[PDB]
Design a protein around this ligand. Structure first.
Ligand code: CL
Ligand code: CL
Ligand code: ZN
Ligand code: ZN
Lengths: 21, 30, 30, 21, 30, 21, 30, 21, 30, 21, 30, 21
């Protein structure tokens, strides 16, 4: 999930758009 | 834009910045 | 607990403190 | 809703619990 | 409400949220 | 103290009320 | 240092930066 | 007091030192 | 991305999120 | 400039990219 | 004022507090 | 640089003044 993609691994602001409503 | 480690409250701050008015879901048990 | 006056990212911070790693939905309007 | 109430007037931490998973 | 790790500035932010107008003391040498 | 209860160990918002003035 | 305009949780953040792990008292009124 | 001065007008970091342990 | 309304330290937070460990310059006026 | 625009009106994350190294 | 560990967004927050109107540079690749 | 002085090692607010513009 988000923790694995962005906290454990790294991610850009583009990848954060995936979790917008 | 860069790839960095965003964790906890910093990650939800980043979500607010990117999504804002649209809203978002923070579901770390997924 | 005291009553809360929270705007923008400060509300998102409060949501993280209350919900934690259970997670939460940030659901504003238009 | 909740997002607007917390900012325009006031809200409680118990109201914020409603939006957790 | 959940049990989580609150450290440093995040812990004092949590104190402000919970206590607010009442005030608080952050005394980590205790 | 507070660091041991909330930072090293974990604690809820109820436990944080203990350190209000 | 520049003069500070700090409200709500931003003051608490500044207190943590100034005092650190010495600790501090946040003492507002009514 | 200090809390209100910092928000209504301005304060310095030297004034904030007074409230440390 | 949504448009941003950012004042004071919130802009600095956004700059860190966008630039990360590349770094950035915070350049206001007078 | 950018600092004042983001606060007085609005700015985009793409405008903020200009100030990275 | 104390010596403490300031990292990431907390370090840029500390820079904003100290420098404010003057501005600052955060260049961690130096 | 700043990361070495303030994040890896420790530093005061006086040392942070060095990175003001
Ligand atoms: Cl951290
Ligand atoms: Cl604000
Ligand atoms: Zn704010
Ligand atoms: Zn942090």
């Amino acid at each position: 999930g988000i923790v694995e993609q962005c906290c454990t691994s790294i991610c850009s602001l583009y990848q954060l758009e995936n979790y917008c409503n | 834009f860069v790839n960095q480690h965003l964790c906890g409250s910093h990650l939800v701050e980043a979500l607010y910045l990117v999504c804002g008015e649209r809203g978002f879901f923070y579901t770390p048990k997924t």
